[PDB]
Symmetry: C3
Amino acid sequence: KDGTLMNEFTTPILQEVMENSKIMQLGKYEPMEGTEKKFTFWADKPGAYWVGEGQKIETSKATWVNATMRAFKLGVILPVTKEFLNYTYSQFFEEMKPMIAEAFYKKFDEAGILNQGNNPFGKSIAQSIEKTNKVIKGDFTQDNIIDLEALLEDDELEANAFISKTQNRSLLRKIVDPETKERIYDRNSDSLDGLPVVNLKSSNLKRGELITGDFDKLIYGIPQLIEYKIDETAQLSTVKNEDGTPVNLFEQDMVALRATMHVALHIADDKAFAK
Amino acid sequence: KDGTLMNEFTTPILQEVMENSKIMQLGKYEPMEGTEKKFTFWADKPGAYWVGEGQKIETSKATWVNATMRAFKLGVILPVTKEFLNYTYSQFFEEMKPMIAEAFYKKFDEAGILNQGNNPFGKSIAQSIEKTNKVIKGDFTQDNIIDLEALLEDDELEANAFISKTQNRSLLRKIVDPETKERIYDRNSDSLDGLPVVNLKSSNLKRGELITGDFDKLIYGIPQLIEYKIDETAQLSTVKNEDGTPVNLFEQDMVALRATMHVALHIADDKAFAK
Amino acid sequence: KDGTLMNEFTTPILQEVMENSKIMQLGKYEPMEGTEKKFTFWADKPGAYWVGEGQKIETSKATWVNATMRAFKLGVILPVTKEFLNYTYSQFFEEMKPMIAEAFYKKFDEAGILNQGNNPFGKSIAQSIEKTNKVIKGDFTQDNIIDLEALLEDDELEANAFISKTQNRSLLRKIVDPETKERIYDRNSDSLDGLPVVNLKSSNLKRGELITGDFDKLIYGIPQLIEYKIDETAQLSTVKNEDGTPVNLFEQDMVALRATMHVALHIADDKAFAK
């Protein structure tokens, strides 16, 4: 029962999502340990005659929270016996070692970009929106896009790239100004004010494009190694009983990964409101 | 306590039983997967004048049930510490890897030949005797042997080789015809009608020789590999407690084996009856 | 939390204690198996005229009890994750493989020398003091040292070397005769009668120097090997639960060691008494 050999092919959507997630982060200068901290604040005070003005700047803030990749899989447990007997299932498991690692990289970037997704807690757009008021409620408009861009530009510096989902892109392309084309209307990516927007995969976000300022990304690197003892959910196919076993049966190779993201001071956000 | 080094020698009876079990099966053309099926049936219908006779033959039957070899042993668990310390016990365990594999091959052939032995269920003589009436009850006789051979020859084809146990061979050699020698009486194996009988090890069978028609045998091949985590019965010698351990202590190397036997249409059988 | 990298240096006291423990034993001719036994007893009987004197000597006594080194450590379990990430903790664990093995060698010699320390039970000074009266109660004195030496010399042979602790050495150096210097008074080790005393680490002994006769030492040799499944005490740092796990998490490499000590007939002992 349930013993058949079949060839499996990798999906094209997973490869496109992995490239989109890497471009959305835009990290610079990767470090092994979380030691880097911003100290600049700039203090200045003016007088008129015979006055002693005091100026001092001191700050320390470092974020370090590693996210581990998935080890043993419940679906791979049934395929473990198929991998030993058939060459087709063994080749599929080898391709899965690179497929799941890209998916783990995509989920790490999603946790910082979206407030609902939690993995590191207190990084990128998720920490910026809760601490400082930047997100605007309502429908997307050409006049509203110019107003939202001005508020983001006022906080220290101006935004370079904006992350947008495919579902949000459809609503953005539909909206157009009376005289100006604004939303694409040719071949290139649509721009709200001037700068081009980059595509990013999102599950929590549905409507509205969010822009990110400056954020550094650092990762150790995803590796693949076979493991004999690993904690997994109980599963039975034929003539087997499982209740508290982890060392007796191996399902999938344990992947080790460590990635850390630097927290941003201010980030632009947009969300649709319904009443 | 219980710590002594001694040299062990392999028994001659196990080697003879392994060769007898391989000859008794008489398998032809081994396959990796159970895909082969018999389709021939032969249909024929005769008439006289202006008649439309319909003839069609279609059949599909494939048997596939793999039998796994024994892994960790309870007797080898006490010998595991002796193998690490002494070279004599380690050499005995290496010889046991080939000895138990031959015993596993002998048990697989016994399951098809004898109805009581179950491993695959629904193969060779065990499936033929239950589905079709072929076995005869009573004492072995020269006139009875000729009558039993005629019934086996009527079903499709004639029998080539008959499997016989050592206990059944003693009763067979004692019986002899009034004019003809019949049972050996020289040097070669005893024949009931004409064709020679092959020796086979049997635990369930006691009296009466059983003949097998055509049956194909296919096996992947017995291998030996060391294992750290394997489910075994609890055992304690000195200063140890066991209740639910499989990964902590290793007893014997886990042997992997897969063998499948093709089901036969008709097979001759003989058994003694008592009242 | 609790994640910092720091360089660790080996202590000088552990190296000095290891050399002192090896010198205190003074074992000769090492054997793999406990088969050696003393048979000599010497029997003699004298007469005068027409007398038949019978003389016979037969004896058999062999001691064999192996002591195993420590495997997984509770302190190393927290350092296991630090060893994989940082090179400083991994180098400290490699040095610990040789440090703990020397400590295990020191504890084995302490079990025979001191009655309180049990590992083998029935070896060296621990078996000699309980079976035969040799230990003297009271304060250490120059006249008492000469009296204690005479009792030890009477039993078969004379003592060659005496084991002394650092705490007992301070009291021994303070005591001195009216005319003779006795206790060191130059540079070399202090002698009670003539022969020099060797330093040995002791936890049970506090006052009084004990002398050992003849005792053979035999050991297989300490080795280091990595283990996946080993029984250890439950420990948790962050987001982990432990109750009955040994195979899932590895703390330290399992060291295998076997050492045996030959029992002595008579050994000198000294202890202080308080009323």
